[PDB]
Amino acid sequence: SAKAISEQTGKELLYKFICTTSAIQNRFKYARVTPDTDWARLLQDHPWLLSQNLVVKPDQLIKRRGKLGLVGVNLTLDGVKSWLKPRLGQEATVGKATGFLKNFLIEPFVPHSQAEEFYVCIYATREGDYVLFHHEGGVDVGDVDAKAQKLLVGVDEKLNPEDIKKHLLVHAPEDKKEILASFISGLFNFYEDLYFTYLEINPLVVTKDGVYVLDLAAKVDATADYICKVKWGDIEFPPPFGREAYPEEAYIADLDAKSGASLKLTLLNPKGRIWTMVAGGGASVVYSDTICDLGGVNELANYGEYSGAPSEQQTYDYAKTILSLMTREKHPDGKILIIGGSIANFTNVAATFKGIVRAIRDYQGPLKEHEVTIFVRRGGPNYQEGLRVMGEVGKTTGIPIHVFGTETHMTAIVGMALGHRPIPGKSTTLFSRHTKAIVWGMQTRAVQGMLDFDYVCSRDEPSVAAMVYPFTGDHKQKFYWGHKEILIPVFKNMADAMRKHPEVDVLINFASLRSAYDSTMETMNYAQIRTIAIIAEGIPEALTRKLIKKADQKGVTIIGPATVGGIKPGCFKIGNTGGMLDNILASKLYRPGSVAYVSRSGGMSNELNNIISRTTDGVYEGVAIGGDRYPGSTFMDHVLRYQDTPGVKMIVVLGEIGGTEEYKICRGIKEGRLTKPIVCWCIGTCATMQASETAVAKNQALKEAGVFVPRSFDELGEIIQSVYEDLVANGVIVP
Ligand SMILES: Nc1ncnc2c1ncn2[C@@H]1O[C@H](COP(=O)(O)OP(=O)(O)O)[C@@H](O)[C@H]1O
Ligand SMILES: [Mg+2]
Ligand SMILES: [Mg+2]
Incomplete structure (x- = not known):
């Protein structure tokens, strides 16, 4: 994500790196x-x-x-x-x-007159970077979004000095124009070169002695550190003005920094009785929403997550911190710990749970004294063994620990824990039975995952025809098509793989973060590829904008970045999407249903697989667009495809606080473009503890346009089932 930097940091960066002919004073x-x-x-x-x-x-x-x-x-x-x-x-x-x-x-x-104060700002959007100027800078600039001259430097375009002079600076004093334009040009090269996403100077002062930068607020794209460390150095990212961190938050942050696993902790109310330890970013938000929705906002102790497949030791260090935090003082009503999450695609639930179990053992004493009750709900690879050991440590330590599998609605445990219930152009079709894919990168477990799936789907041929990996020479990789053993060619060069397999129209890109941009751009030089899944997380936003631009030009559909992928039961599945065969079978992903869905998160997408398979004839197609600021394809892109897919009878969208994507769905229905029943729920309703961008604003607005919005995630399954049953009754869905 983009992150704020201090004024000193940005000024220092600007004084070091800006190239302008204009004289900058007080460096x-x-x-x-x-x-x-x-x-x-x-x-x-x-x-x-x-x-x-x-x-x-x-x-x-x-x-x-x-x-x-x-x-x-x-x-x-x-x-x-x-x-x-x-x-x-x-x-x-x-x-x-x-x-x-x-x-x-x-x-x-810096002595100067009011008339010598100017305003300049640059900021990023999907379509490029806007440069704003106003000739009246300072504390009284006002609603500058409304008053300033604006120019858009498009994706991969240049800022033309003539436009700066003849459009941006039309109201500036004539004798300041040349110096202002040199500075601005310099400022934009600097902005782009150092991976800024936001940069404001107000006031920019210009006297007879030159340019003074009196104030500066900025954000940089922090994912670009692998490119920019050479210029940034040990750049710090300050927290918002507010309270200082607790040592435990610092401890976890330091823990987060030393691993690919995302490990996050924030204390809301250290004296709260409700503590959570959730796997999955989406799930993390949903559990918080649920706790607030059921009246627990004031007892919510913390929010955070442990995601992206952490190790046993990492989960142990995480768990031990939370266990310590919830035993600093007793609550007269005892305490709850929610160990939940969605259904993992690749995390090892057995390994993670073993870590938590170690911690519980170490803290059993204070835990019993503090009357902690523990609720557990989790799916994923090896989740059965994970649940078993969690139940075991409960029996063994004497701590009350209730464990639940995927049959239990994800959020149901919060109600149980609180006593509310008893404890028991671009194409329409991307994939088909014929789809053949090339996989970029050495991901043999993933590929075998796709073949196993293809096999239970009774596919005639394997869905992966070839691999590409430039870090080695041509060779063959061994896989299993059932008990039969087959070979899949691995090419050093993408051109070879393409030419030898012209029937391939999908590429699944597992390139690590440093290769993902180039390999994706290269792939789009081969018109046979109509769909690309980009797995890598951490691709800088400005690079993803270039990928998007080319894809739009080329008519290629991009799913990702930062996604597990998606799945089309019976036909095709992307990489690790859908986890082990165990979960493919339980959620009936081996044959099509009538329900299509889209969400940002792959964690919650697997949950949607579960929910949809238990309440309907099953998934027809699901897609995870990934959680980057600019996804290669949007909610609306897929909702449109689904509208145009006869086999799709209803559509589920799991939306989210932030941005205005879901309003496109409203307008779509009001303009008569979208006619199939659409179920939608936007997570992040409690996050609040622009306004049209909140999950609450969105849920309400979608509800008013004829979208089926449940009252909460906890009722999401119910409404999906209700809309489905009506579709069966009306002869629209034939199981
Ligand atoms: N070094 C300076 N020399 C002269 N005037 C200054 C200086 N720094 C700030 N000012 C004046 O103070 C005002 C507010 O300062 P600024 O740093 O812009 O903070 P903020 O925008 O947070 O109010 C500026 O608009 C400018 O008029
Ligand atoms: Mg200012
Ligand atoms: Mg991390």
Whole structure:
């Protein structure tokens, strides 16, 4: 994701890296101050502080400091010391946030007139980067989105200086135009080169002595560190202004940093009685939503997750932290721990649960004393053994631990735990029975996963015809088509694989993060490939925009990045989608049903497989578009395909807080483009504890347009079943 950086960080970056003919004054003239600052060292290190008057202000991602009286202007060093005395180390409140002011920036005062303050901003969107200028900068700039000249530098296009002069700068003083345009051009090259997604300078001051950057707010695309570490260095990403982290949050963050597994923890209410430990990002949000929906918002202790297949040791270190946090003080009503998640596609549930079980053993004493009750619900590879050992440690330690499989609706355990219930162009068709795919990368377990599936589907031929992996020479890989053993050619060069298999029209790209961009661009030089699944997570947003541009040009459908893929029962499945054969059979993914779905998350997609197979004639096609800011294909892209697929009789969409994608579905129904029944639920309803982008706003708006929206995830299965039964009754669905 994009992440904010401090003003000092961005200024430093700008002073180091910007190439402009325009004279930029006061380069590197800034000093940082905290409660631990030695004012003697500071002064020795920054003797310029004595040269001239100064400005002092906090650097903690607080907006509008001028208006809030947090900017000391035109002071001597002594005046600065005295302005800081009542403020430094003191609590301040800004909006809903309260925290200590502990980080200040000191800079030279820059005399200038109001007319010498300008406004400039650059920010990213799917279609390119907008450059904004306004000739009246400063604390009174106002609604700049409405007032500023704007220019869009399209994906993979250049910023033309003539447009800067003749459009962006039309209202600027004529004698500042040349210097403003040189600066702006420089600023944009800098923006793009260093992988910024947002960059605001207000005010940009221009006097007779040149350009001064008085203020700067920015975000960088943090996934681009593998490219930009050379320029960024050890760049820090500050948290929002607010409370400081608890040591446990720090511990887990450090844990997160040393692994591909995503490990996240945030304490909401350390004294809360409801603790969660959830596998899957989607599931993590859904469990929180559920807890809030059932009245538990004030008892919700934490939110977070442990995803992307962590190891036993990692899960143990995670679990031990939570167990420690929930035993610092007793709750008069005892405490609940929710160990839930969706149905994993590839995580080893046995390994992860063994880690949790070790932790429970280590903390059993305080756990019994604190009257902790534990609820467990989880699916995935080896989940049966995982559930068994969790039940065992309960019996063994004397701790109450109720365990549940995939027959139990994911969120049902929250109700049980709270006592609310007893404890018991681009094409329409992407895949078919004929689909042949090339798989880029050495993923033999995944490929065998696809063959096993093809086999139980009674496919005539295997769905994978060849592999591509440039890190070795041509050779053959051995796989099993049932008990029969077959060979699959592995090519060093993509061209070879393509030419020898012209019947292939799908590529599944398992390229690691550093190869994913190039291999995908290369693939789209071969028109036979109409569909590409991009698995890798962590591809920079600006690169994904280029992939999207080319795909749109080329008529190629892209699923991903950052996705497990998707599945079309009876015909084809992408890589690890759908887990082991165990889960393929239980969810009946070996033959088609009438229900198509789309979601961002693959974790929740497997859950949808489960839910849909228990409440209907089953999945017809499911797709996970992945959770990147700019997915190669959108909810609406697939919903449209589904509308145009006779075999699809109803459509399920699991949406999400953020963005406005789902409103396209509304307009689609109101314009008569979409006519099949659509079930939708947007997760993230409690996240709140622009507004049209909330899950709540969206659920309500979709409900009003004729979309079947349940009251909560917990009723999602019910409504899917109800809409289905009506479709059977009306002769639309023939099981
Ligand atoms: N170094 C400086 N020299 C002169 N004036 C300054 C300086 N820094 C800030 N100002 C004035 O203070 C105002 C607010 O400062 P700024 O850093 O933009 O904080 P914010 O936008 O958070 O209010 C600016 O619009 C500018 O007019
Ligand atoms: Mg400002
Ligand atoms: Mg990680």
